[PDB]
Structure formats: C-alpha cells, structure tokens
Design an enzyme around this catalytic site. Structure first.
Site, PDB file in Angstrom:
ATOM      1  N   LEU A 282       4.427   2.111  -7.790  1.00 34.69           N
ATOM      2  CA  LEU A 282       3.961   2.019  -6.415  1.00 34.69           C
ATOM      3  C   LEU A 282       2.679   2.822  -6.255  1.00 34.69           C
ATOM      4  O   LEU A 282       2.308   3.625  -7.114  1.00 34.69           O
ATOM      5  CB  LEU A 282       5.016   2.506  -5.409  1.00 34.69           C
ATOM      6  N   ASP A 283       2.006   2.594  -5.134  1.00 40.64           N
ATOM      7  CA  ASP A 283       0.728   3.213  -4.824  1.00 40.64           C
ATOM      8  C   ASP A 283       0.916   4.337  -3.809  1.00 40.64           C
ATOM      9  O   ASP A 283       1.911   4.389  -3.080  1.00 40.64           O
ATOM     10  CB  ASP A 283      -0.245   2.160  -4.281  1.00 40.64           C
ATOM     11  N   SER A 284      -0.062   5.250  -3.774  1.00 39.53           N
ATOM     12  CA  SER A 284      -0.108   6.256  -2.715  1.00 39.53           C
ATOM     13  C   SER A 284      -0.352   5.620  -1.355  1.00 39.53           C
ATOM     14  O   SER A 284       0.052   6.176  -0.324  1.00 39.53           O
ATOM     15  CB  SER A 284      -1.181   7.300  -3.030  1.00 39.53           C
TER      16      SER A 284
ATOM     17  N   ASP B  62       1.188   2.810  -0.669  1.00 42.95           N
ATOM     18  CA  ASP B  62       2.566   2.471  -0.335  1.00 42.95           C
ATOM     19  C   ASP B  62       3.393   3.714  -0.043  1.00 42.95           C
ATOM     20  O   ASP B  62       4.360   3.640   0.722  1.00 42.95           O
ATOM     21  CB  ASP B  62       3.182   1.668  -1.469  1.00 42.95           C
ATOM     22  N   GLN B  63       3.013   4.854  -0.632  1.00 43.28           N
ATOM     23  CA  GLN B  63       3.629   6.132  -0.279  1.00 43.28           C
ATOM     24  C   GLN B  63       3.446   6.439   1.199  1.00 43.28           C
ATOM     25  O   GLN B  63       4.422   6.710   1.906  1.00 43.28           O
ATOM     26  CB  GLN B  63       3.036   7.254  -1.129  1.00 43.28           C
TER      27      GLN B  63
END
Ligand SMILES: NC(=O)C1=CN([C@@H]2O[C@H](COP(=O)(O)OP(=O)(O)OC[C@H]3O[C@@H](n4cnc5c(N)ncnc54)[C@H](OP(=O)(O)O)[C@@H]3O)[C@@H](O)[C@H]2O)C=CC1
Ligand SMILES: CCCCCCCCCCCCCC(=O)SCCNC(=O)CCNC(=O)[C@@H](O)C(C)(C)COP(=O)(O)O
Ligand code: SF4
Ligand code: SF4
Ligand code: SF4
Lengths: 208, 176, 114, 80, 287, 156
Positions: D38-40, D42-43
């Site tokens: 996942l991406d930051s 998405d974080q």
C-alpha cells in the site's frame, strides 16, 4: 539644437543628484544604485531585504514625504539569475517629484509584501502574484485577479507565448464550454525588424 | 488657482429659513424641474428619418475598403506589402506574383473584415493610394463566410464606384 | 548560496501539509458534486483527484512542494466558494476527446507527430 | 459498550469496507503499508477514513506515526 | 484523390481531416450529434435542410469558420438532391417521422427517399454510404413503420450493395423519445425484455466506421449492455425521477439480438451503461 | 386554395407582428456598448422602430452581442443566452465580437462570438457607426420578413 528639441534644466538634475547622494549616505545598508537620467527622474536600486525599512523611511522623515504610491511591476529580464524587477513608483504630494524604487528579486524568494505600509499595494501585489508568481509572505489575501480561475501559467512571463495554450469552444456533446489545445486560424507572423548598424553610439556595451 | 464649492451656511435670518421651509413643505423646485422639462417638451425634437435622411459625415470617413485603378488603366496596386507590414491586426494577406507582362503584381489580396479595426494606416501607408477606405458603411452580412473579402471582390467594389472616392480624394489630397 | 524557502525545513512538513490538503480535497469533492448538479460518480472524481496528486510525485525540491501546496489551496478555496462555475469544474475532467494514444504506428498513420 | 474489542471489530469491518485492500488479512502485526503493498497516500486515506468513521480529528503527526492496524486501534484506545 | 481531402496534422477546429460528409436529415437528434462529432473531428459537413433556417441556425455554430455548409433539398426532385451530392466523399441517410403526415406516410419516405438518393448517388460515384435503420424491422406485422423500413433495407441492400446498413437499438439520451414518454405518462403495465443503448456510443461508432475503411459491406447492429424487462426499467425511471399508440406498440413489439451480424466489438469503443447516463440525464424532477 | 391563402396572410400578419417592435437586450461589454448607447441617443432613434432598450433578459427578442468576448465571460454569456425565449435572434456587433478582431491573436479571448452562440446578423466596424448598426437592424427586419415558418408548417 534649440528648435524642436526639448531643452532641460540642470538645476533639477543637481537637486536630484544631491538628494540621491543624501539618501544613499543615510541608508547605507541597502543602497546599490542611485542613478539619475538626463531628464531628472530619480532611480534607487535596492537589495530585497530593506523593502519595509526603506519604504517606512521614504513615507516620512519630512525631507522626502512621497505619500503617493504607483506602479509595482517586476520587468521580466532573462540572462540573469535574479530575473524579476519589483518597481515601486513614488510621488511626493509636498515636493512634486518622482522616484523609482527598483528592488531586484528572483523567481522563488519573496520580497517582504509592502502592503503593511502602503494600502494601495494590495491589489497591485495580487496582480503581480497572478501574472508572475512573485510570492508575498505576510499578506492578507493572495488570489487570482485579472486572470481566469481555471487558467494557469502566469502569462505575463516571457516563457508564456502570445497565444494561450488553452482555447474555449462550446460543444453540444457535454452541453457546455470546454477548453482545447490551441488551434490558430493564422500564424501571427514575426517580422525580423531588429535592424543592424548601431543607431546609438553612446549606449555601446563593451564586447568580448 | 482654485475655486471650491460647498462653503456656506443656512442663513439664520427668518426669511431664508421660512423659504427653505416653504420648499420643504410645498414641493417647489420639483415643480420647477417639471417646468424645465415641459419647456423641452414644447421644443421640436431633433431626429432624423433614418432610411430617407442619412446622418451627416466628413469627406474623410473610413468605410468600405475599396480599391482604385489607373485612368483607363490597370490595377493601381503593386503588391509592395506596406499595408500588411502596417496592418495592426494583420488582416491584410498578400501573396504576390508577376504576370506574363513583366510588371510586378499579386496573386492574393485578402482583407479580413473581422480583424479590421479601421485605423487608416493602410491608407496612409499606401504609396500609390491603391487601397482607399471607402465612403459607405453597410455590410450587415447574414453569413460569416461572406465577411472575408477577396481581391476580386475589392476590384468589383472599386468598380461599383470611383467617382465618390475620386471626389473625396480630389477634395482632400492637400491635408494628408 | 543563500535561499529562503517558503515553509519547509525537510520534506516532513511537506508530507504533513500535502496530506492535510488531500484530506481537505476529500471532504471538498462531495459537497461540490452535489452543489454544481454535476453528472459524475464520486468514485471517478476522487480517483481523478488522487491521479492528479500522483502525477507530480516525482518532485523532491521542497520549495516546489510548498508552491504546489499553495496552488492547490488556492483552487480548493475557489471551488469551495461558488466562484468557479460548471465549466471550469468540467474542464478539470476530460470527457471530450482528446483520443490521442502513445502508440508508434497510430502516430505514424496520422503522421508528423513524433 | 465501548471496549477495546468492539472498537477493533468496527475497525475490522471498515477495513473490510475499504475497497483496494486485497484481502483484509488482519493481524496485530500486520503493517499493511509495505507487507501488503500500500501507499502512504492510502495510509492517509485509511487514517482520515477512520476519522470519518467514528470520532476525533486525528491530526497530521499522529496520522504519520501509525502505519499499522493494531497501532491505530491502540491509538484510539489512548485517545477515545 | 485530390489534395485537401487527405488529413492534416492534429484534430479539431478546422484541422483538415479526411471525410467530406453529405448528411441527409441532421436537424433531428442523431444527425445533430453526428455533425457534432464530425466537427470535433474537423470534417466538412454539407447538409441540406427543408425547414426554416432557424433550426439549422441553432445547430449552425457547431463547426469552425465556414466548415459546415447549408443548402436545400426536397423529397420530390432529383435535381436538388443531385446538386447536393455533386461532390461528396461520404453520404449518410437518416430520415423519418414516427407518425404519418398529410403528404407522407410511413411508406415512400422509407421507400421513395432512398431510391432517388441512391440512384443519383450510384450515378454520382459516392463511397461509404451509411444508411440507418431501426432494429428488427421485418416483413412481419404490427408496424407500417417497421415493414416500410424493411422494404427500404431491401432496397439499399439490393441497389448500391456495398452500403453500410447500420442499426442501433432504441437509443436514449438528452432528447430521447421513449424516456420522454416515460416522463410524459398518464397508466398501463406489460412485459417486454429490452436493451437500451446510449446515443454517444452509437454516434462514436458511426463516425469511427465512416472514417475507418475496409469495414464496408457488412450491416451492423448496436447492443444495449443490460437487456432486461421494460417494466423494471419503468420502475427504475420513476425511482430515479423521484415521482411515483404507435410508439407504445413499437416499444412493446420486438427486442432481440441477432447472431448473424457484427456489432460493437469489431469497432473498439467502450459501452456506456444505462445507469450512469440515466442518472446524468434524469434532471427536471421536483427540486 | 384559400387554405394556402389564409396560411400566407396569417404568416404575414404574425411575422410583421414579430418584426414590428423587437425590443432587445443590450449586453454590451466594451466601447461598442457606448456606440449602442449613441444609437440610443436623440439623433439616431429607436422609438420609431418599436425598439425599446431594456436590460430584462427574460423578454429579450433579439440580443446585441457587443464588446469583447473573453474566456471568463463566455459561460456567463451563454447562461444569459439560455434563460431566453426560443424565438430569438442575435446581432454580433463589432470587430472584436464577430471574429476576434484586433484581439484575435491573444489568450483569454474567444475568437469571435461564433464559438458560443449562433449569429444572425454580423455588423462590423470599430466602432460600427450607429448609422451602420441601425442599417444592420433594418436588414435583420428583412430577414424576419423572409422566414416562411407557417408555410413550412402547412405544407409539412
Ligand atoms: N430510438 C430511436 O429514436 C431510433 C431511431 N432510429 C432512426 O433514426 C432516425 C433519426 O431519428 P430522430 O432524430 O429521432 O427523428 P427525426 O424525425 O427528428 O429525424 C428525421 C430527420 O429527417 C427530417 N425529415 C423526416 N421526414 C421528412 C420529410 N417527409 N420531409 C423532409 N424532412 C423530413 C426530420 O425533420 P426536418 O424535415 O425538420 O429536418 C429530421 O431532420 C429515424 O429515421 C429513426 O427511425 C433508429 C434507431 C432507434
Ligand atoms: C475534479 C477533480 C479535482 C481536481 C483534480 C486535480 C487536482 C490537482 C491537484 C494538484 C496537486 C499536486 O499534484 S501536488 C503532488 C505532490 N507530489 C509529490 O511527489 C510531492 C512530494 N512527495 C513525494 O514524493 C512522496 O510524499 C510521495 C511518493 C508522493 C508519497 O510518499 P508516501 O508513500 O510517503
Ligand atoms: S500599400 Fe498599396 S500598393 Fe502597397 S501592397 Fe498595399 S495596397 Fe498595394
Ligand atoms: S484599416 Fe483595416 S486593413 Fe487597414 S491597416 Fe487597419 S486593420 Fe489593417
Ligand atoms: S470593435 Fe472597437 S469599438 Fe467595439 S469593443 Fe472592439 S475596440 Fe471597442
């Protein structure tokens, strides 16, 4: 030399020369150039840190009143690292004289937002922010005024060409007006008018 | 020298204050305005009956963009490109060729009627007075195609009249 | 070499302001797509918003990141008001082609576009 | 009716309700950022999504310090 | 072929594209969208009208400066039609009123109009003639509409055989007929399975097929993506719109697929569903 | 053919009724608006032609687009155009408005008002002289004289 050529007064030249020498001596922290042209209008060329101190001096002091504020522009000069030129223009109600406070600046570092002492500078600073991108820290409201909202590019630069990149048209597909890449109907021809042969021998720069 | 306004006071004398009270409670200078407007009512109004009476002008109006030609002669233009060099919206479009004779002439001489701001610079710039701003101003064109003149349209428009153009120039070739 | 940055010290405050700006854009989208009587699902609009964010992820210079944050804040203000109309909001989208792909042979048929 | 396990169950089904996570695969040491791809981006999506779910504002530095499901649950257990 | 018919540069706003299209109709719905997408392509459209110039005036500024051109036609003489199709790259035939008039039936517009225009077309030498038709227009019963369209289909198939005979399903859009009748209700309830196809995929398919050669001769049919019951669709319309004889018979008549002829997939265009565009178009309800 | 006779006479009556008054709305962005107010002047009349200058958009018969159309102007211009009854006519006045004009090569400017609204009557000039504009409105009236709507409706 006398008919149909405008004569001048050396008296006003000596007055502005002595006054600019005086201002250069009594604010040494930021003065770089005090230049006087042939027709006696003063230019003071200033580092971009003494904006607020020099304008607080030049609004007051009872030797240079200069309440009247005028133009602000930052004449886009390439072949420099400090590209833009913020030009304050000041007029004295008491003394009838024009001084041009030219401070220099680069693309990204702000000068210090003269609206604190000049209430006329608000939409001037907003205009310069919209057309160029000279940022103004410690300012109440920076918006885009004299451009479209959805348009960007800072168009009065030299990097922005004559025609815009976008061009509107209505279409009945999505029943509204949309922007497209520009499809000119004609060229805007370009006349190479910069003729040779040195029309002014006095303004020759030294070549390499 | 200065001559400013609004430096007085309402006069405390009884006659002036009762006159201001009379204007307040009696609606006087309003009726004075009604009298002035009825005086303009009883004038004769200055109108012109438009399709029959046309409004006056000067001999140097800038209208039609017509061309001229020589006395029993050929086309007055040389295609010397001065009008396209000066045209401040670049509406002139000149492509030039010489013909089989040898004198230099054109191929394409187009005026955009959209871009034409009607300065007069192409009239002042023409060394032989080839293009002349015309006398009449009735274009009123239903289609946008028809507002792009060709050189043949300009020659027909310069051969529908010269006598107007010649009369205006022959009256005022001395000022310019 | 003296350079005065806008807001930044390292990219930590850059990350902080850009994630707060993205939170503002997230709570900005449904109010506007309800207000302007638009015609696009909320999923598609939010995915185009995050696609526009993911376009310029290749910038490490912090002054540029500050100026991007300030531009995005400006347009978030001008869309959270009713100052921008339906035309500019649809102009962010591309529903009118613009069909041009990046194939070699496709650009070789409709030629002179290398 | 506000315990740790009820908050963890509601965090669990809203992690089920998020779309791009494939699968849920809950753990106390999950670290959905790099162990789940996942991406930051998405974080911060998930962090302010929990903010949208059930309460307090969750500012920027505490949004950065989580990166992990059970650490989110424990941070809410600290804050709520 | 001569120059200024070859494409030039990019697309849009008097970029000289390929086709020069003589369009019959174009004052209605699908022809107007088709002129719109050819103006986006940047194609010169020669359209004759028969009505007041105000209708062609409010569909006039679609093109760029002087691209599209307007002239006159009539349903009687070959001279005006032939003058309209003197110089044309492609030509499309879209015509038809969905009720009989005083001077025209369902017969002889669908019959007599493609006869004369195909006559002067085949004597003229046009290429890529695209003739529309309603879907499932048979020799079978219930519609003078559908049987005269089947006769016109046989005519356009027989004379000038390499015409693209094209048919969509019953299309919906901003100015739909049957969704407007769904709005202009009162009622009655029947059963019919039906697939609706949105208008912009249809006209994108038509412009792609008319600009892409080697796809000629074959008749095409456009497919709706859902294909469910009419009455469930009426419930869907009332639900999204917040409120609780020829046209109704011709929507209750026939809606099927045909495995013979190729459709969307041999063209490469994305299908827009009913639901998205229906939510987009169902405005004008109570607040 | 007294049916056709009644159609032709009634069409003449209704179209003369349309072209009789024709009160416009003056949109009027730049100095072309000043020249329109100068054909509102007491010399070049508008009372004589039934023409009442009126800022109301809801009752606008014709609309005189004048001035310089910009990109910021255009959606608001077409929103003005929409809330307007469907019998409507457009006079594009001014070199700026009928094809871009002196600001043709620029940004922020739509190249004439053809790219927004349809145009019935172009009248060029900078400014188009009030006399010439009044001539353009007369040729607009003659376009209204040739419209044949009821003829097309009867033999439709
Ligand atoms: N769901 C649907 O509606 C579907 C429709 N089609 C077909 O698509 C075509 C276009 O449909 P649509 O736009 O809705 O209908 P229209 O009636 O609006 O289109 C027909 C066009 O031709 C003109 N026309 C028709 N009859 C005559 C005539 N006797 N004399 C002169 N001109 C005539 C019309 O009016 P004018 O004369 O004013 O120009 C119009 O411009 C039709 O043929 C229809 O059968 C096909 C599949 C589905
Ligand atoms: C209608 C839709 C609404 C409009 C849609 C368009 C909106 C346009 C907004 C424009 C805003 C931007 O594009 S700014 C993008 C910033 N990109 C960056 O790379 C900034 C630097 N940051 C980074 O490199 C990193 O933080 C990453 C890689 C982006 C994220 O790393 P995380 O993982 O640690
Ligand atoms: S300036 Fe006169 S002679 Fe020269 S090209 Fe123009 S019209 Fe012709
Ligand atoms: S009057 Fe018209 S044609 Fe002549 S220079 Fe001016 S814009 Fe050009
Ligand atoms: S055409 Fe001339 S008068 Fe009219 S708006 Fe433009 S500059 Fe002004």
């Amino acid at each position: 030399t006398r008919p149909t050529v405008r004569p001048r007064n050396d008296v006003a030249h000596k007055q502005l020369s002595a006054f600019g020498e005086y201002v250069a001596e009594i604010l040494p922290k930021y003065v770089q150039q005090v230049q006087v042209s042939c027709f006696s209008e003063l230019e003071i060329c200033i580092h971009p840190d003494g904006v607020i101190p020099v304008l607080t001096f030049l609004r007051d002091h009872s030797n240079a009143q200069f309440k009247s504020l005028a133009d602000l522009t930052a004449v886009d000069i390439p072949t420099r690292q400090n590209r833009f030129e913020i030009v304050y223009n000041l007029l004295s109600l008491r003394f009838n004289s024009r001084i041009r406070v030219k401070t220099y600046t680069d693309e990204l570092t702000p000068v210090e937002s003269s609206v604190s002492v000049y209430k006329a500078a608000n939409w001037y600073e907003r205009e310069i922010w919209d057309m160029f991108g000279v940022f103004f820290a410690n300012h109440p409201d920076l918006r885009r005024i004299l451009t479209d909202y959805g348009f960007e590019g800072h168009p009065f630069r030299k990097d922005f060409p004559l025609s815009g990149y976008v061009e509107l048209r209505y279409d009945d597909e999505v029943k509204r007006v949309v922007a497209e890449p520009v499809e000119l109907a004609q060229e805007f021809r370009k006349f190479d008018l910069n003729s040779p042969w040195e029309a002014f021998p006095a303004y020759r720069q030294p070549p390499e | 020298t200065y001559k400013y306004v609004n430096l007085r006071e309402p006069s405390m004398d009884m006659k002036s204050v009762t006159d201001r009270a009379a204007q307040t409670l009696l609606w006087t200078e309003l009726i004075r305005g009604l009298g002035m407007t009825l005086s303009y009512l009883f004038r004769e109004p200055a109108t012109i009956n438009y399709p029959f009476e046309k409004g006056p002008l000067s001999p140097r109006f800038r209208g039609e963009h017509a061309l001229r030609r020589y006395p029993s002669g050929e086309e007055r233009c040389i295609a010397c490109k001065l009008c396209e060099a000066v045209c401040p919206a670049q509406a002139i479009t000149i492509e030039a060729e010489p013909r089989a004779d040898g004198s230099r002439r054109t191929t394409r001489y187009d005026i955009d009627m959209t871009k034409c701001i009607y300065c007069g610079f192409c009239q002042e710039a023409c060394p032989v007075d080839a293009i002349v701003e015309g006398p009449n101003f009735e274009f009123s064109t239903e289609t946008h195609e028809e507002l792009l003149y060709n050189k043949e349209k300009l020659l027909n428009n310069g051969d529908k009249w010269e006598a107007e153009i010649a009369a205006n120039i022959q009256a005022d070739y001395l000022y310019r | 070499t003296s350079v005065k940055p806008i807001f930044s010290r390292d990219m930590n405050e850059a990350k902080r302001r850009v994630r707060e700006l993205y939170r503002a854009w997230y709570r900005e989208v449904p109010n506007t797509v309800h207000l302007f009587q638009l015609d696009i699902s909320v999923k598609q609009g939010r995915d185009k918003v995050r696609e526009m964010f993911k376009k310029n992820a290749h910038v490490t210079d912090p002054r540029v990141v500050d100026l991007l944050v300030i531009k995005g804040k400006m347009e978030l203000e001008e869309t959270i008001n009713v100052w921008k109309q339906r035309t500019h909001v649809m102009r962010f989208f591309h529903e009118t082609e613009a069909p041009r792909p990046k194939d070699f042979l496709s650009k070789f048929y409709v030629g002179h576009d290398p | 009716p506000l315990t740790l396990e009820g908050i963890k169950d509601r965090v669990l089904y809203v992690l089920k309700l998020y779309d791009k996570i494939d699968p849920e695969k809950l753990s106390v040491n999950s670290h959905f950022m790099k162990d789940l791809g996942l991406d930051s981006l998405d974080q911060v999506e998930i962090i302010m999504a929990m903010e949208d779910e059930f309460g307090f504002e969750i500012p920027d530095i505490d949004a950065e310090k989580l990166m992990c499901p059970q650490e989110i649950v424990d941070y809410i257990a600290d804050k709520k | 072929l001569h120059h200024a018919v070859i494409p030039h540069g990019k697309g849009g706003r008097s970029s000289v594209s390929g086709i020069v299209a003589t369009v019959f109709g174009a004052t209605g719905f699908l022809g107007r969208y088709l002129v719109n997408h050819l103006g986006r392509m940047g194609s010169q459209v020669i359209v004759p009208y028969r009505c007041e110039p105000y209708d062609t005036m409010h569909l006039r500024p679609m093109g760029d400066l002087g691209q599209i051109i307007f002239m006159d036609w009539n349903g009687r003489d070959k001279d005006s039609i032939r003058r309209a199709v003197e110089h044309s790259n492609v030509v499309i035939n879209l015509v038809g009123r969905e009720w009989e008039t005083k001077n025209f039936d369902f017969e002889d517009v669908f019959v007599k109009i493609p006869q004369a225009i195909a006559q002067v077309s085949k004597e003229a030498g046009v290429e890529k003639f695209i003739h529309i038709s309603h879907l499932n227009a048979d020799i079978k019963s219930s519609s003078k509409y559908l049987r005269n369209k089947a006769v016109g289909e046989k005519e356009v198939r027989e004379t000038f055989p390499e015409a693209t005979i094209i048919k969509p399903a019953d299309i919906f859009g901003r100015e739909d007929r049957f969704l407007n009748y769904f709005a202009n209700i009162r009622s009655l309830g029947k059963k019919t399975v039906k697939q609706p196809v949105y208008i912009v995929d249809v006209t994108k398919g038509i412009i792609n097929a008319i600009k892409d050669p080697d796809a000629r001769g074959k008749t095409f049919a456009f497919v709706g993506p859902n294909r469910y019951l009419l009455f469930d669709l009426v419930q869907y319309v009332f639900a999204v719109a917040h409120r609780p004889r020829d046209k109704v018979e011709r929507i209750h008549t026939t809606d099927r697929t045909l495995p013979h002829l190729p459709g969307l997939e041999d063209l490469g265009v994305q299908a827009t569903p009913l639901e998205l565009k229906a939510i987009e178009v169902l405005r004008r309800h109570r607040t | 053919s007294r049916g056709e006779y009644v159609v032709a006479k009634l069409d003449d009556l209704i179209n003369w009724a349309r072209r009789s008054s024709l009160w416009p709305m003056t949109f009027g962005l730049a100095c072309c608006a000043v020249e329109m107010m100068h054909m509102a002047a007491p010399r070049y009349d508008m009372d004589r032609f039934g023409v009442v200058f009126r800022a109301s958009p809801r009752q606008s018969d014709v609309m005189i687009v004048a001035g310089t159309l910009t990109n910021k102007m255009a959606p608001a211009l077409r929103k003005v155009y929409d809330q307007m009854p469907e019998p409507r006519y457009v006079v594009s006045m001014g070199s700026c408005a009928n094809g871009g004009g002196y600001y043709h090569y620029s940004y922020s400017v739509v190249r004439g008002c053809d790219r927004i609204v349809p145009v019935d009557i172009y009248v060029p000039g900078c400014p188009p002289t009030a006399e010439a504009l009044l001539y353009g409105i007369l040729q607009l009236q003659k376009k209204i004289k040739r419209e044949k709507r009821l003829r097309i409706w009867y033999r439709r």
